């Protein structure tokens, strides 16, 4: 039959009724007197739910433009479909109704950057949540900027000192690289990041104003109690006057935890772009990926491996490539990134873990089986590398550190045979004891980062065999006695002279003879 | 004449053309955008609508934004005028030395040459690396793979390859940095400034390498086609000017990764472990253009990322078949500190036949492989006993294989900046006799 071709209506859209309502309703002779809702810079909500609003209209909206609902809550126009717009919501979707008006703002998403953000605790969009008033000495920059290219960068030569001994000697970090902190839960990741920020406070007073590193802590997905503990700690130590604290927490909406590291990176790019140095720490980048996975699954984008989208590599790569050491024609500033990734039972073959391992330069791989062997910070030395190498290692620390790497490498390959205590060799037992003293050397309390000169003196104390008489159970006191019983005049000249000078290696050969040790 | 943007979902834009749709792989310029946005047509959707991938970020695209058709694919400047430059995916200069001189403006998409223009000349390339010159010898004109995970030494191996063969070579060379770090792209650019391979200013014409950079920050439409841009720049030298080129591709894995990042938004339902259905076909369509024809030769060195040291993952497993010589790197030998961390019982070549290198090189390489496999088959015993019950029969094999393991390592000149040891160049007869 010639009517069977029109049997099932072939529909090319889902919101067809909102287009036939645009033309049937002004056909009432009563209803042509400007009785039509507009669609150019305004938009009706079609359907709210789970933090997504499908918005009819907004014919002039840009992709990624910050839009605003008439309820007050903002949003970001993310999907631009042929008929509607998929607007993720920067707050609770419960205040957004079907049929509400959506106002576009003309702006891609903005954050306040400047010196006015120092000392303040902001959320993922720059609103301060600490309660000391608004942000005053700031200007509003973009949150999604292009990473600086090949010409805009230069090589990473100068070092950034963490204060942790196992990462200033074995895995050294230069101003301008990105060092992943990867491990399981409760292993030392936030502890290593906090020791880095506290040691930047310690180094910022002994250097001129062109060497100061202003840290930025991005806390994505944590509790507000953890962020309150960290702000209490950064106030107690005094590191808040250099630190920005961007906290999109767990109760906050998934687009805020998605856009929090871009917010903190744009705040740190102010210090990068003005010749100073920054230290951005994206804490739990894996929770950013989880928030982005939620935000993209509810936008009906097709999932992939572990239900993550396709562009979750691009999500982290276009964020981490904004940590650059700029060239001398752009001020020469830098930005060091410290993404933190949580793995499940040491599995680095997971999706996001392989992505951010391949993106970053190094990795500080922490283990929970070395965390409970007393070796804390729990750095798995065999897997923790830094691909700048010794180019941005402290000289003097570099003079003992390659041998430290070598002796721990020998101690690791002499291990898994030390269950045979009867096997008296004396060709392996010396390195099996020396590696035990070196493993006991790199242990450190948390919240107390040691300056770099005391570190390289205390590794020069153990790589030469000065502690070979000391029992393995009290080298953590022997190192404190070495540091507190040598002169406080050597550290002043090793900090200034920048390497172990030959007028210092024979001075402190002998200054480590008149120190008394807890070991006999 | 123009079409207009109808749909923007990340890096995938649908452009609606009122009559006379552009062809597939054609290039489209978005007029009105701030930066130069270029879309490449991926498929025809069927309602006067093409679905594109974008060569830059789509943040700021309005629906209804006009889009002009260029009538051709992405055309890049090629020729002598690119020698010593840094090019974009779309052929723009990003070295800030001004515009690029033009022998021609070639489109980046072609077919693999034919079956008839294949040159069957298996001839050796001497590198200067003992494990490369010994166990997996390289071919002049054939494709080379540096397989490894993250941090095992692929980029350092490719840098020692660059200053060992591309430093002293007759024809030109092309470094296509596909989806890697901007930092190491800058380090390689500055190291090739400082050693004279790229000359700035008015000595620019005497430079002998072209950089094409498609690094990690750039959206996957750019990372998917910067390899084809670099290959077109090499193909001009191979075909038109008829010479021997080298194509150093850094992490060809990022090409397949970039196709996978957009493939779900292209309407393709997902394949196995996270990749597109057309993984092997895209990898073959890229790789089959890199051949020594009757006109010239392209001796490519392709770094390949292997995700989490898993060679069974299909994106490193498919590109084992498009190569003549594979140099597989391992984390296990890197745990021993031995560098270059080449696995001697996993690195192959078609140049390990005794009809191409001779019986002295083949028999020394097979003797090394035999003693190393004997050692790997005795490590299960000597990790529970400790070399006391073998009774001087298979003990000397262990104490020769443990010397061969150390002697396969070699200091690199490009690794002098890391470690304070000078670099070596070991001649082929010298390593053959020494092994």
């Amino acid at each position: 039959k010639a009517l069977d071709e029109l049997r099932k209506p072939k529909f090319s859209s889902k919101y067809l009724i909102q287009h036939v309502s645009q033309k049937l309703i002004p056909a009432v002779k009563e209803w042509e007197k400007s009785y039509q809702p507009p669609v150019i810079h305004l938009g009706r909500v079609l359907s709210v739910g789970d933090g997504i609003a499908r918005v009819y209209g907004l014919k002039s909206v840009q992709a990624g433009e910050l839009v605003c609902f008439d309820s007050g809550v903002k949003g970001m126009a993310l999907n631009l479909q042929a008929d509607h717009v998929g607007v993720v919501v920067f707050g609770n979707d419960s205040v957004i109704h079907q049929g509400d008006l959506v106002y576009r703002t003309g702006q891609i998403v903005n954050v306040p950057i400047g010196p006015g953000t120092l000392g303040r605790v902001t959320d993922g969009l720059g609103q301060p949540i600490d309660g000391k008033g608004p942000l005053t000495n700031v200007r509003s920059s973009l949150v999604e900027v292009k990473a600086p290219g090949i010409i805009a960068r230069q090589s990473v030569r100068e070092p950034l000192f963490t204060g942790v001994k196992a990462v200033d000697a074995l895995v050294p970090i230069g101003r301008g690289q990105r060092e992943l902190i990867i491990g399981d839960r409760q292993t030392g990741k936030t502890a290593v990041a906090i020791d880095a920020i506290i040691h930047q406070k310690n180094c910022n007073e002994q250097v001129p104003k062109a060497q100061r590193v202003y840290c930025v802590y991005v806390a994505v997905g944590q509790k507000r109690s953890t962020v309150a503990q960290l702000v209490k700690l950064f106030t107690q130590t005094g590191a808040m006057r250099y630190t920005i604290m961007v906290s999109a927490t767990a109760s906050d909406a998934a687009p805020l935890q998605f856009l929090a590291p871009y917010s903190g990176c744009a705040m740190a790019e102010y210090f990068r772009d003005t010749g100073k140095h920054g230290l951005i720490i994206y804490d739990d980048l894996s929770k950013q990926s989880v928030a982005y996975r939620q935000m993209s699954l509810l936008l009906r984008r097709p999932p992939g491996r572990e239900a993550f989208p396709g562009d979750v590599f691009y999500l982290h790569s276009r964020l981490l490539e904004r940590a650059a050491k700029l060239s001398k024609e752009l001020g020469g500033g830098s930005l060091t990134a410290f993404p933190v990734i949580e793995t499940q039972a040491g599995d680095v073959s997971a999706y996001i873990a392989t992505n951010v391992i391949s993106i970053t330069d190094g990795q500080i791989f922490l283990e929970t089986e070395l965390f409970y062997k007393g070796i804390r910070p729990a750095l798995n030395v065999g897997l923790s590398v830094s691909r700048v190498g010794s180019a941005a290692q402290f000289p003097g620390m570099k003079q003992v550190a390659g041998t430290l790497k070598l002796e721990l490498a020998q101690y690791r390959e002499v291990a898994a045979f030390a269950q045979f205590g009867s096997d008296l060799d004396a060709a392996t037992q010396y390195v099996l004891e020396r590696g035990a003293r070196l493993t006991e050397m790199l242990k450190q309390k948390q919240f107390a980062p040691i300056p770099i000169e005391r570190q390289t003196v205390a590794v020069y104390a153990a790589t030469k065999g000065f502690l070979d008489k000391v029992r393995v159970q009290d080298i953590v006191a022997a190192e404190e006695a070495v540091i507190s019983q040598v002169n406080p005049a050597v550290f002043k000249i090793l900090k200034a002279n920048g390497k172990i000078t030959p007028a210092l290696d024979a001075h402190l050969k002998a200054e480590l003879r008149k120190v008394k040790l807890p070991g006999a | 004449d123009a079409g207009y943007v109808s749909q923007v979902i990340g890096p995938v834009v649908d452009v609606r053309f009122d009559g006379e749709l552009p062809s597939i792989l054609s290039s489209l310029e978005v007029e009105g955008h701030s930066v130069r946005l270029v879309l490449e047509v991926a498929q025809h959707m069927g309602d006067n609508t093409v679905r594109c991938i974008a060569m830059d970020s789509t943040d700021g695209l309005v629906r209804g934004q006009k889009v002009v058709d260029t009538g051709s694919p992405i055309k890049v400047p090629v020729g002598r005028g690119t020698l010593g430059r840094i090019m974009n995916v779309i052929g723009e200069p990003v070295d800030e030395q001004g515009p690029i001189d033009a022998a021609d403006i070639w489109s980046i998409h072609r077919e693999a040459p034919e079956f008839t223009e294949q040159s069957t000349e298996q001839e050796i390339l001497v590198t200067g690396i003992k494990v490369v010159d010994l166990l997996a010898p390289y071919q002049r004109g054939g494709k080379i793979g540096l397989f490894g995970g993250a941090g095992v030494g692929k980029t350092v191996l490719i840098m020692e390859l660059i200053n060992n063969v591309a430093k002293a070579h007759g024809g030109f060379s092309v470094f296509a940095g596909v989806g890697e770090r901007t930092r190491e792209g800058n380090d390689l650019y500055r190291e090739m400034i400082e050693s004279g391979v790229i000359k700035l200013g008015a000595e620019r014409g005497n430079s002998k390498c072209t950089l094409v950079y498609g690094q990690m920050n750039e959206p996957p439409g750019a990372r998917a086609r910067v390899a084809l841009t670099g290959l077109t720049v090499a193909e001009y030298f191979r075909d038109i000017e008829g010479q021997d080129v080298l194509l150093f591709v850094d992490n060809i894995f990022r090409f397949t990764q970039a196709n996978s990042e957009v493939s779900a938004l292209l309407g393709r339902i997902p394949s196995a472990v996270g990749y597109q259905p057309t993984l092997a076909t895209d990898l073959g369509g890229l790789q089959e253009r890199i051949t020594t024809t009757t006109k010239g030769s392209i001796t490519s060195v392709q770094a390949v990322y292997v995700p989490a040291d898993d060679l069974t993952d299909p994106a490193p497993a498919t590109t084992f078949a498009h190569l003549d010589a594979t140099t597989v790197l391992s984390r296990s030998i890197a745990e021993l500190g031995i560098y270059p961390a080449v696995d001697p019982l996993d690195s192959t070549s078609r140049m390990l036949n005794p009809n191409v290198i001779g019986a002295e090189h083949y028999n020394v390489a097979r003797g090394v492989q035999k003693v190393l496999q004997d050692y790997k088959n005795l490590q299960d015993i000597i990790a529970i006993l400790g070399m006391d019950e073998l009774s001087e029969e298979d003990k000397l094999t262990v104490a020769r294989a443990r010397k061969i393991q150390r002697f396969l390592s070699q200091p690199f000149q490009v690794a002098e900046v890391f470690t304070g040891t000078p670099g070596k160049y070991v001649d082929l007869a010298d390593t053959i006799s020494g092994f």
Binding site: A345, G346, D347, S349 | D310, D380, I384
Partner: peptide, 15 residues
Amino acid sequence: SNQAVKQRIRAIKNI
């Protein structure tokens, strides 16, 4: 993780 068990199986199988 899944590669640990298959290699550990061959370890215990040769032991």
